[PDB]
Design a protein around this nucleic acid. Sequence first.
DNA 1: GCCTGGCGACAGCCCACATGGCATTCCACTTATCACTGGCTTCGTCCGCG
Length: 259
Amino acid sequence: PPSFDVTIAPWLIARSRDVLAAPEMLGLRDVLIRSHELSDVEIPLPPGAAVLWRILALITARITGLDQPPNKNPKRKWQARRSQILSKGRLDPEAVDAYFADYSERFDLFHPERPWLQDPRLREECPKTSGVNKLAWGRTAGENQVWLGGHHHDLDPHPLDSAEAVWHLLATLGYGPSGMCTARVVRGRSERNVTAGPLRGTVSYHPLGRTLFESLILNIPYPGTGAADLAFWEQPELNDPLGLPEESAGLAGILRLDH
DNA sequence: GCCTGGCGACAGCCCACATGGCATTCCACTTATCACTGGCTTCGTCCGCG
């Protein structure tokens, strides 16, 4: 069976502190563990990186951010723990595996159920596949002309590398076109219309440092005190199309990652 | 052959201005006008044509 894991499979290009020659691609778990070692991890698509730094800020960061500044001058104490871990200069791998451990079997995007940032049921109710060309950026869609980025005629399209596929999926989850995508029925409801992505047409500002760990630490908005939150992949069960997108005072609702 | 010199006689000098004047009014516009088109998505439905 096909399987890919963000934690173990290599997709994230990584640059080391030394030499600055031959960046190697690594998984998400490895980057997390070897963070002080690497200066940065890079994605060729700025949309892909714009959502990427958002999700990476919810993993390493969440564990370090703690999701809980109650009493004690909240802002002051989070900045105190912040100074404490910033002083350590690194994250203990055992707390990473523990986080990964909670949902270790839930990451491999190609999951039959619970695929990464995806809806698995979707396959059954949509008659026409959008196609890779409609998903991937710089790639021509059905109505798009054949002039740029290699010519894709939408007949025998060359498949995206799985690592490549991951970058695109993440971008479309951030930036995404609005109106007239392919309709899927849900108990009688068919509406090809689609609204735009949450950050669409914007510049995301991520502070950097000398090493990875620094940036990841300095990348988390301070979560105000509020309801405990979780991510789309931290959701216990699927949302369903109908109904209200519930609010989320937690930072996962402030990383625009609740839904 | 090349280079240089020569081919009646053909003028000279002095002289060169002062003074005065040089314009002024006036007049200087209005009206109307000032483009369109497109370079998004997929799909579905309708209308026209065969």
